[PDB]
mmCIF file of N, CA, C and O in Angstrom:
data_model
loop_
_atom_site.group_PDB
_atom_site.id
_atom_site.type_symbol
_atom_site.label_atom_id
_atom_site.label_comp_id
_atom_site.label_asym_id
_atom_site.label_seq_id
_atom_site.Cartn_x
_atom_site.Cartn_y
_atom_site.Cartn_z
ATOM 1 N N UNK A 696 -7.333 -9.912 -8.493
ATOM 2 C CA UNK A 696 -6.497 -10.175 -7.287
ATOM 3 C C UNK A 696 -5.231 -9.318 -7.347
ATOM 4 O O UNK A 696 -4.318 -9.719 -6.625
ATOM 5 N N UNK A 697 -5.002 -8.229 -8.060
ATOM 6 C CA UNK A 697 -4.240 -7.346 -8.228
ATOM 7 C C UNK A 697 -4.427 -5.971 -8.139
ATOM 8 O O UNK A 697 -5.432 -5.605 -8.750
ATOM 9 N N UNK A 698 -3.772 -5.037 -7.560
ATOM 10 C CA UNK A 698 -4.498 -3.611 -7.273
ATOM 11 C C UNK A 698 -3.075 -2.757 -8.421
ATOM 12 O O UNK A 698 -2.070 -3.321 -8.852
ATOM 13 N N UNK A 699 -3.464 -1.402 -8.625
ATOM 14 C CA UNK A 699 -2.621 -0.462 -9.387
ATOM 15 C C UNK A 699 -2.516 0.690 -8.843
ATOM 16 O O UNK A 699 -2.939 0.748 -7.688
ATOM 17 N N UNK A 700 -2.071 1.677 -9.309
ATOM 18 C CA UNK A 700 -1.317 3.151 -9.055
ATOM 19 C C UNK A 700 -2.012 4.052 -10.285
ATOM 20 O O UNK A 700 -1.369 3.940 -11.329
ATOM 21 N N UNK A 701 -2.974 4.764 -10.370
ATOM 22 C CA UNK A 701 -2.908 5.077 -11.637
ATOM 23 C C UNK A 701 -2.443 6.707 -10.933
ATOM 24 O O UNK A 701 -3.139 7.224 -10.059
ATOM 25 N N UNK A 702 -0.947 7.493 -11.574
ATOM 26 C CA UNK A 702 -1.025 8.853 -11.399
ATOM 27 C C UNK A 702 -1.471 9.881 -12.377
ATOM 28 O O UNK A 702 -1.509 9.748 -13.600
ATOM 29 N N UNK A 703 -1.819 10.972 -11.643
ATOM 30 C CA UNK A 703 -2.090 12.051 -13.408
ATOM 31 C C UNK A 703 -1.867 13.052 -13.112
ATOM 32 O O UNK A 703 -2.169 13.123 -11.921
ATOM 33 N N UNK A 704 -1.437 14.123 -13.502
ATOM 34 C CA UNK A 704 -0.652 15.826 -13.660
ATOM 35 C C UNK A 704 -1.979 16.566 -13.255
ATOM 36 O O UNK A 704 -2.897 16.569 -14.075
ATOM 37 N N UNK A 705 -2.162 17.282 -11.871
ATOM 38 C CA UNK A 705 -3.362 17.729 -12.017
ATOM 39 C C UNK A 705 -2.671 19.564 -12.405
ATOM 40 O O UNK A 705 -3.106 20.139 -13.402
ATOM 41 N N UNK A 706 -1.764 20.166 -11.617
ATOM 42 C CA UNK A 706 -1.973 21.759 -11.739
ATOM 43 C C UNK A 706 -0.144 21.500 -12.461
ATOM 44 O O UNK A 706 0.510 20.597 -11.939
ATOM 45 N N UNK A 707 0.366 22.143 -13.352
ATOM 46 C CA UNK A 707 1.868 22.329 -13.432
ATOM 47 C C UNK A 707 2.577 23.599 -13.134
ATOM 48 O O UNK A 707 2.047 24.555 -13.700
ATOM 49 N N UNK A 708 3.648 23.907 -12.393
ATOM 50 C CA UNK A 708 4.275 25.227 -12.772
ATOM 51 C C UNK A 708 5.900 24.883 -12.790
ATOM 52 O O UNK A 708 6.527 23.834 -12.942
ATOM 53 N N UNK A 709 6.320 26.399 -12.540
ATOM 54 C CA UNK A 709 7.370 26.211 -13.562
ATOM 55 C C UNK A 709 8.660 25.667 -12.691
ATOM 56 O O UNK A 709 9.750 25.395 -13.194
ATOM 57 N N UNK A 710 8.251 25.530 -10.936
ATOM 58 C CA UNK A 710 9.454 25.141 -10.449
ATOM 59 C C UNK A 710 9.025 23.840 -9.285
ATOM 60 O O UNK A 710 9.528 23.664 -8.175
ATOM 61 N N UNK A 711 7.603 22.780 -10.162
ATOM 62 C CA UNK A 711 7.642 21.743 -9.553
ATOM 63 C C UNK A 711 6.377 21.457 -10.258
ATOM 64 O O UNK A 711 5.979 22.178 -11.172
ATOM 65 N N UNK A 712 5.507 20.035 -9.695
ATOM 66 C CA UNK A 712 4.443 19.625 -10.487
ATOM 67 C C UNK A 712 3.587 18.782 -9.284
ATOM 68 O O UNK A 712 4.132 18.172 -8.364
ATOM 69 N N UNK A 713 2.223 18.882 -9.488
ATOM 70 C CA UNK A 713 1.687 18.416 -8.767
ATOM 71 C C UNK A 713 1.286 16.693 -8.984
ATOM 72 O O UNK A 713 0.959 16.413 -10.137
ATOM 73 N N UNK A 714 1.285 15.716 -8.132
ATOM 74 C CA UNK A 714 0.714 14.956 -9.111
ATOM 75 C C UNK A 714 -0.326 14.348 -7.474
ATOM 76 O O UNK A 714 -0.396 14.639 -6.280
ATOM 77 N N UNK A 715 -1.024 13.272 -8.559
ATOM 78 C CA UNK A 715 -2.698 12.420 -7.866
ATOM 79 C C UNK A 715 -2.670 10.812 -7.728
ATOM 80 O O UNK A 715 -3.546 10.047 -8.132
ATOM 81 N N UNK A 716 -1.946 10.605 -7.329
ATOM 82 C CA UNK A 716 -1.468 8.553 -7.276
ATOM 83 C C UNK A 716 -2.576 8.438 -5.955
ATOM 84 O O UNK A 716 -2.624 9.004 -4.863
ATOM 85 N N UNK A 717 -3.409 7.445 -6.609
ATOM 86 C CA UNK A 717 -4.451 6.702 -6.476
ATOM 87 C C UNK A 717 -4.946 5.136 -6.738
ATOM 88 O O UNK A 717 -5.273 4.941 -7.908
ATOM 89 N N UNK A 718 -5.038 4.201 -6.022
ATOM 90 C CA UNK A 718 -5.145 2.781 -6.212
ATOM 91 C C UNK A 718 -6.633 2.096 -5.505
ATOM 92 O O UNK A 718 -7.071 2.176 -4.357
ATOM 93 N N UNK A 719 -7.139 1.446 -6.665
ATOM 94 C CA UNK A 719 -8.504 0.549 -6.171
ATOM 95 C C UNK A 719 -8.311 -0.611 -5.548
ATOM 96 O O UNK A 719 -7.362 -0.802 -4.789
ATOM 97 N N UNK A 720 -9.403 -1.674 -5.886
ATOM 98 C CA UNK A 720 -9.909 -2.655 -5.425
ATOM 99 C C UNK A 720 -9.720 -2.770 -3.658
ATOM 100 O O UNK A 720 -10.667 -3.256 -3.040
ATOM 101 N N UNK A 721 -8.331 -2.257 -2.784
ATOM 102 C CA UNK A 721 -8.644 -1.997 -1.624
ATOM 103 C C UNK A 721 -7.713 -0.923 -1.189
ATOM 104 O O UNK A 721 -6.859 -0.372 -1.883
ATOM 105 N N UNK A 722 -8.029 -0.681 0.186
ATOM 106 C CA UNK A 722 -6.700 0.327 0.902
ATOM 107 C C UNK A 722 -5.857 -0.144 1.616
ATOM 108 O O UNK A 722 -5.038 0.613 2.137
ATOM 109 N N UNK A 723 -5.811 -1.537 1.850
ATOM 110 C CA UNK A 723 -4.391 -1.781 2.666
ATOM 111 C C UNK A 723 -3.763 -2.394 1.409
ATOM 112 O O UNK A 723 -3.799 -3.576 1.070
ATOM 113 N N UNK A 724 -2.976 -0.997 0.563
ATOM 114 C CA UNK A 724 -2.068 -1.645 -0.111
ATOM 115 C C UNK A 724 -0.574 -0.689 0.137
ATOM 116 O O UNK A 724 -0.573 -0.096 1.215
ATOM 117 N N UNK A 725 0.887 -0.449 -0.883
ATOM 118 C CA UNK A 725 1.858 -0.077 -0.220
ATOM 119 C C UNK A 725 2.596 0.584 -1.597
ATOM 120 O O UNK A 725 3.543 0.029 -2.154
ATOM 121 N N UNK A 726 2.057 1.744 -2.006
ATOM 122 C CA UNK A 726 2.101 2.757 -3.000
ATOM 123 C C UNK A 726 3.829 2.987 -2.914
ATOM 124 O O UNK A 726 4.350 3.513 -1.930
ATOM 125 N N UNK A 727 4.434 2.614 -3.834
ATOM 126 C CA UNK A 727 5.312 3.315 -3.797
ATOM 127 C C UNK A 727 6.257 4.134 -5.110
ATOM 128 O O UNK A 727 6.060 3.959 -6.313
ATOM 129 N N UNK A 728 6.921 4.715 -4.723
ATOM 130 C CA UNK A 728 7.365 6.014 -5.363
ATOM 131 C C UNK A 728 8.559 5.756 -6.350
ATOM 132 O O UNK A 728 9.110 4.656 -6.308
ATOM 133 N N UNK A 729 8.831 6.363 -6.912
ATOM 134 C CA UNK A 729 10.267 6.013 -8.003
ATOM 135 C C UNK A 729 10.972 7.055 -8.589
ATOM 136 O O UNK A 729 11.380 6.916 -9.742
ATOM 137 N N UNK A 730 11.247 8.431 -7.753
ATOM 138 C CA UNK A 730 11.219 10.056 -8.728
ATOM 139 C C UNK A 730 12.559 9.591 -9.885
ATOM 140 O O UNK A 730 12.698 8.403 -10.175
ATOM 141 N N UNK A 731 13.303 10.452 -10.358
ATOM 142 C CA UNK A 731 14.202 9.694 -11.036
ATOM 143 C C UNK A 731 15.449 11.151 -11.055
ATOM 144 O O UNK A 731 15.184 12.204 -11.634
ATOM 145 N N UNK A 732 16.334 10.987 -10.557
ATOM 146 C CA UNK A 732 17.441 11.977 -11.092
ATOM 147 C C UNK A 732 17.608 12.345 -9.508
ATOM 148 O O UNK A 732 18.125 11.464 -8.821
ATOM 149 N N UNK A 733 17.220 13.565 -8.857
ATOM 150 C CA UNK A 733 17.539 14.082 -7.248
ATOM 151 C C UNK A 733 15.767 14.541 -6.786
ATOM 152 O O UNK A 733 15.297 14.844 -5.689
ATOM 153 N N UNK A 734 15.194 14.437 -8.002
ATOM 154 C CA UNK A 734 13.677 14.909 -7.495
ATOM 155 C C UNK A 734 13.111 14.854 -6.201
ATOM 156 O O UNK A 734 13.216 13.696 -5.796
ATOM 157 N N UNK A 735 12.523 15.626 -5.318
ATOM 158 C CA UNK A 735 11.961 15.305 -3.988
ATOM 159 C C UNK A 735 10.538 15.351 -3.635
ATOM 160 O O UNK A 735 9.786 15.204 -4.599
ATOM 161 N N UNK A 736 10.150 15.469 -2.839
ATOM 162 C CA UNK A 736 8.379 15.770 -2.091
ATOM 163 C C UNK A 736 8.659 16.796 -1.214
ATOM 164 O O UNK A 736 9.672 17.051 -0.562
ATOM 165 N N UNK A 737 7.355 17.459 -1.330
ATOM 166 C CA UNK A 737 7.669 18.674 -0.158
ATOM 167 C C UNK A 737 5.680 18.489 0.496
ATOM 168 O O UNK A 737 5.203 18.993 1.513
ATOM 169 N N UNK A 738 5.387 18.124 0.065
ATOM 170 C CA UNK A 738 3.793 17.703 0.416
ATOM 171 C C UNK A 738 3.057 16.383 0.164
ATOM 172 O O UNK A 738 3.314 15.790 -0.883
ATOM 173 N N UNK A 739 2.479 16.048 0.718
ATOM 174 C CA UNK A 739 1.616 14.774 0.597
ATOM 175 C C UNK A 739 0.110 14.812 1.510
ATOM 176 O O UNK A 739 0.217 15.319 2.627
ATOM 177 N N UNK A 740 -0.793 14.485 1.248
ATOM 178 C CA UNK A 740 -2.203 14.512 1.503
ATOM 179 C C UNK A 740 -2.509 13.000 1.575
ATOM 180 O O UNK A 740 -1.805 12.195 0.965
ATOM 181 N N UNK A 741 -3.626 12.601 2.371
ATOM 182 C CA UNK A 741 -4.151 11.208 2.026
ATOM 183 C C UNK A 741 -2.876 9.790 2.302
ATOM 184 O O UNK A 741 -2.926 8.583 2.066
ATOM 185 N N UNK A 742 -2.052 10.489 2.770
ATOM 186 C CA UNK A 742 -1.194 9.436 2.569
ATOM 187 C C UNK A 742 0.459 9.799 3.246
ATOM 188 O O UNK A 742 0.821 10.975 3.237
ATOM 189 N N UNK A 743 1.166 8.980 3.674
ATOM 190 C CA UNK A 743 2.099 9.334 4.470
ATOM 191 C C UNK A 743 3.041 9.265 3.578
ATOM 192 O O UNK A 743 3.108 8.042 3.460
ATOM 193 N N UNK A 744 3.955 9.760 2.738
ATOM 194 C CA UNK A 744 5.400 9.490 2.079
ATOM 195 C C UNK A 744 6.030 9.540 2.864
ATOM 196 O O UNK A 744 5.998 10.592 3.503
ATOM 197 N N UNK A 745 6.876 8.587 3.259
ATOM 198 C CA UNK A 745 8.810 8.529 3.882
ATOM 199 C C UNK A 745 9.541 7.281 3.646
ATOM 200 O O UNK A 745 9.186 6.159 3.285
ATOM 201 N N UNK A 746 10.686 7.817 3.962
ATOM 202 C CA UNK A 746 11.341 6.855 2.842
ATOM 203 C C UNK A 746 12.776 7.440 3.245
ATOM 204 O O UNK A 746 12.881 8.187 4.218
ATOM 205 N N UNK A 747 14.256 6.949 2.195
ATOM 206 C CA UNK A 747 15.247 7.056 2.110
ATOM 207 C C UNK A 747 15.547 6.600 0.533
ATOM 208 O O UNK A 747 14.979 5.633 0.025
ATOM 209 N N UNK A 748 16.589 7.491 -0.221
ATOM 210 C CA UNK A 748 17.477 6.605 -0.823
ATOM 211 C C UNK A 748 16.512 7.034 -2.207
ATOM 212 O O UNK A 748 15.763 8.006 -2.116
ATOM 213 N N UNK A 749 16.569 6.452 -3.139
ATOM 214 C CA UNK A 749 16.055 6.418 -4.446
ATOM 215 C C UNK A 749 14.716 6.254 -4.834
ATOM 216 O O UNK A 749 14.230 6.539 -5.929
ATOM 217 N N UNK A 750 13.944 5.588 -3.479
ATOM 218 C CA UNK A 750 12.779 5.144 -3.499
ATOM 219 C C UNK A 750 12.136 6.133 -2.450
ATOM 220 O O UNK A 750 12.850 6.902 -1.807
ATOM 221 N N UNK A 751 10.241 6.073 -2.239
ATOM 222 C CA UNK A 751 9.924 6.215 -1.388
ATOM 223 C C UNK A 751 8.669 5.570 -0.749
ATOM 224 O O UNK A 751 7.757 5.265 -1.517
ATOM 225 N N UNK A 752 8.554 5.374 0.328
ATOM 226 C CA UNK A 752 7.383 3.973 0.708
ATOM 227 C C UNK A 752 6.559 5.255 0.813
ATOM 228 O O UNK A 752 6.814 6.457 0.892
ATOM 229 N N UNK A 753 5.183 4.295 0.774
ATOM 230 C CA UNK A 753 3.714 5.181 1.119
ATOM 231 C C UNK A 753 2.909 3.978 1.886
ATOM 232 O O UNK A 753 3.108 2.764 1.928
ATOM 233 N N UNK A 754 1.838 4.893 2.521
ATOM 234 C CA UNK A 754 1.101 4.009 3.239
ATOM 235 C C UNK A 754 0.185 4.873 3.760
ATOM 236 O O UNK A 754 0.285 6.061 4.065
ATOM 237 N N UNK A 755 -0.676 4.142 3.816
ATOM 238 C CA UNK A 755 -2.603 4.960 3.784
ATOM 239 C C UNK A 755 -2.485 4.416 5.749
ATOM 240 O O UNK A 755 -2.034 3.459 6.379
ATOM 241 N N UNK A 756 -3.452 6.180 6.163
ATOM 242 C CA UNK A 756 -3.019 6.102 7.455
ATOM 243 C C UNK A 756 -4.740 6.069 7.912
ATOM 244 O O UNK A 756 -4.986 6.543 9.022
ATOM 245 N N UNK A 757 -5.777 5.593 7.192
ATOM 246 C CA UNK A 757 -7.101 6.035 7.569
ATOM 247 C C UNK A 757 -7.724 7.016 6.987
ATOM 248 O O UNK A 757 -8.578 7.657 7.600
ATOM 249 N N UNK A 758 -7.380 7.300 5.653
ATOM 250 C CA UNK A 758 -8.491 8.213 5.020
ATOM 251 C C UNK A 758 -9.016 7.840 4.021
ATOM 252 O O UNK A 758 -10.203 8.020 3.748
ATOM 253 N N UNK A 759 -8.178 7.251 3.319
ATOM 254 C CA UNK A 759 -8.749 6.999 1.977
ATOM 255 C C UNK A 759 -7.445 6.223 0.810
ATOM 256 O O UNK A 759 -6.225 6.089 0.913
ATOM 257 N N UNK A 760 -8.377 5.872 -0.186
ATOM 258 C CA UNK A 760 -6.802 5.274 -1.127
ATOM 259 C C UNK A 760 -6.182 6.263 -2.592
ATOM 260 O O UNK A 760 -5.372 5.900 -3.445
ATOM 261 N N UNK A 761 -6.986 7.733 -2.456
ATOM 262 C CA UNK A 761 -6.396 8.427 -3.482
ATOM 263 C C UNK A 761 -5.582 9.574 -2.731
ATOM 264 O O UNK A 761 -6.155 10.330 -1.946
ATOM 265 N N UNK A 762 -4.087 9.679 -3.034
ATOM 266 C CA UNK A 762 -3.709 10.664 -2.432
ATOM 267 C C UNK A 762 -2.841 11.443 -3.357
ATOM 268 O O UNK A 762 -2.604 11.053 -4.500
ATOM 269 N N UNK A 763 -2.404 12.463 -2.893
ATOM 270 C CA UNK A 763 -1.651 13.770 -3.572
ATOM 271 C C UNK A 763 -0.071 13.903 -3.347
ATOM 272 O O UNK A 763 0.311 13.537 -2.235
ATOM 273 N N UNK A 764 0.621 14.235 -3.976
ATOM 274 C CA UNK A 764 1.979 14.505 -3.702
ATOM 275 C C UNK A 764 2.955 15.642 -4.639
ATOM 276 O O UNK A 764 3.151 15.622 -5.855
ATOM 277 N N UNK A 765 3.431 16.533 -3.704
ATOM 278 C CA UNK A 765 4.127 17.658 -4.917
ATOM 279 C C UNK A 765 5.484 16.927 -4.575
ATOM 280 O O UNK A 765 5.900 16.344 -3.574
ATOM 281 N N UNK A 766 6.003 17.204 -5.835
ATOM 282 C CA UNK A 766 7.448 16.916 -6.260
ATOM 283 C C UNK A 766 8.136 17.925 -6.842
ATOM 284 O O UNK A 766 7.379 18.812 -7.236
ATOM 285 N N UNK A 767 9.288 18.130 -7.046
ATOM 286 C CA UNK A 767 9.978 19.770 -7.294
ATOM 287 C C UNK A 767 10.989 18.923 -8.549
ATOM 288 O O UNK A 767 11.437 17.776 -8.547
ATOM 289 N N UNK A 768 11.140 20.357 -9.865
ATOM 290 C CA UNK A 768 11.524 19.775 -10.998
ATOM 291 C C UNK A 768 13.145 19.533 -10.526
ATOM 292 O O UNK A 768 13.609 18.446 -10.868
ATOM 293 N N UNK A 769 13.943 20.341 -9.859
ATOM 294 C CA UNK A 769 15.418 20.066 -10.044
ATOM 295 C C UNK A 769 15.916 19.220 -10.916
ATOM 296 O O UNK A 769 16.516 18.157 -10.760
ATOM 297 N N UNK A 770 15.555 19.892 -11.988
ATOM 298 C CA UNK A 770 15.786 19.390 -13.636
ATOM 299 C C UNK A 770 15.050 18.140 -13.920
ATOM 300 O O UNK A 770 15.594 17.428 -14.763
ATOM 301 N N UNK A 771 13.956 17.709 -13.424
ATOM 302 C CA UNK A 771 13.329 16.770 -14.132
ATOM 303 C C UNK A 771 11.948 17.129 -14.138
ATOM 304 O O UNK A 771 11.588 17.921 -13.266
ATOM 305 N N UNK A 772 11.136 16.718 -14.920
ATOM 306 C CA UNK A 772 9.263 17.368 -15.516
ATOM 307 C C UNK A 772 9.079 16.041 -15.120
ATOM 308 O O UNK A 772 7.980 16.314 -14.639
ATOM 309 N N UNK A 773 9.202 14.634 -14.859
ATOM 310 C CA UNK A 773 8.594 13.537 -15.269
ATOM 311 C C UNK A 773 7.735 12.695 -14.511
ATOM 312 O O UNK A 773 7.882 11.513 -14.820
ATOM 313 N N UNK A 774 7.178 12.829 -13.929
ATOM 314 C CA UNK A 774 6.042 12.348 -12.753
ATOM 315 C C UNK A 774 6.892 11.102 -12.118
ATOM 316 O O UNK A 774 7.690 10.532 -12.862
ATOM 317 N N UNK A 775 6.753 10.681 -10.828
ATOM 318 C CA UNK A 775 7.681 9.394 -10.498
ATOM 319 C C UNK A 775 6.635 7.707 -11.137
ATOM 320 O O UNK A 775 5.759 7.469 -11.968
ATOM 321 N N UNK A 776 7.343 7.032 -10.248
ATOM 322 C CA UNK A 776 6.349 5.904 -10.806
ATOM 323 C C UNK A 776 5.884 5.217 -9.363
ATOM 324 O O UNK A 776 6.674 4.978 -8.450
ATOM 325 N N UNK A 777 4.432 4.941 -9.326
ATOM 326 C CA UNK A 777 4.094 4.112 -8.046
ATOM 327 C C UNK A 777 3.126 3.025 -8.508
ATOM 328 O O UNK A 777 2.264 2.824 -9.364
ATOM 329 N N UNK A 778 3.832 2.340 -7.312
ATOM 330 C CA UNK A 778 3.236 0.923 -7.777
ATOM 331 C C UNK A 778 2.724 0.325 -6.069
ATOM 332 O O UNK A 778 3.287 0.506 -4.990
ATOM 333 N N UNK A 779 1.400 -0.454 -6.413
ATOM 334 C CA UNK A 779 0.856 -0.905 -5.328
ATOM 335 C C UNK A 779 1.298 -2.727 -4.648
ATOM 336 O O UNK A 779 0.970 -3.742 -5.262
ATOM 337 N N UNK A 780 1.764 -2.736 -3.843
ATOM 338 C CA UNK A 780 2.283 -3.720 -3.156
ATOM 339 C C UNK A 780 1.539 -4.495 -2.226
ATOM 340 O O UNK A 780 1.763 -3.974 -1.133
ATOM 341 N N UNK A 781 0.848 -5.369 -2.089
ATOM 342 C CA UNK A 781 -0.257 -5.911 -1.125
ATOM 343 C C UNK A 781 -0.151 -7.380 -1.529
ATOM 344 O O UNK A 781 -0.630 -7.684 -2.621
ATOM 345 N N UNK A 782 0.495 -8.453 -0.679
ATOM 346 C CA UNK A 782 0.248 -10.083 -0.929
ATOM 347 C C UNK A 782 -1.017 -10.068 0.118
ATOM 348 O O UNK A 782 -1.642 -11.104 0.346
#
């Protein structure tokens, strides 16, 4: 009765990182983001990122529940953290 986020590093370079946040058991759940320092998104697939502030909401718009997101290093390597939200 609980769903997850699992992310993983698919391609790296040297002035951002790609990553793959993906969640089972269903798709109406509410992925969200955690970069840490000024980190941003400049792409997303499968999935809508927007947001404000420190955080960023996600939400599956009709495709599917694994989606993609680039993030840019401005001094940080560290993948964000997402977590799936669904009562």
């Amino acid at each position: 009765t609980g769903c997850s986020v699992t992310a993983t590093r698919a391609e790296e370079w040297s002035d951002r990182f790609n990553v793959t946040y993906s969640v089972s058991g269903s798709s109406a759940w509410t992925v969200n983001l955690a970069l840490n320092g000024s980190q941003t998104i400049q792409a997303s697939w499968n999935a809508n990122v927007t947001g404000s502030g420190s955080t960023r909401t996600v939400t599956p718009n009709g495709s599917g529940n694994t989606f993609g997101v680039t993030v840019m290093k401005n001094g940080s390597s560290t993948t964000p953290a997402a977590t799936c939200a669904g009562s």
